[PDB]
Design a protein around this ligand. Sequence first.
Ligand code: NAG
Lengths: 48, 48
Amino acid sequence: NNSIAIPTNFTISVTTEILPVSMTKTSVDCTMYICGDSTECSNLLLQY
Amino acid sequence: VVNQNAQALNTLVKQLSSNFGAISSVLNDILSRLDPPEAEVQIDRLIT
Ligand SMILES: *[C@@H]1O[C@H](CO)[C@@H](O)[C@H](O)[C@H]1NC(C)=O
């Protein structure tokens, strides 16, 4: 109740914080991806 | 955000016009013009 601890010195530390801000901007085209270079699969896709 | 919600609703109701590979998008005509054991397959495809 009558005692306090007081620092007589100090240390200047440096801490590394790594934060991701973005991801790869990947683009996928449906018509090419699910239906490869064929018209009939594209006609079946148009029903979807 | 208002436009995104409106576009989502518009696409959702436009998806009813889609056939999803069924003979027609409209449920009533395909139910009327098809016998039970193939109409149910078409109805299931539309429901999926
Ligand atoms: C404080 O600590 C540093 C090392 O971090 C030391 O060089 C310095 O002499 C210290 N000072 C006192 C007053 O103890």
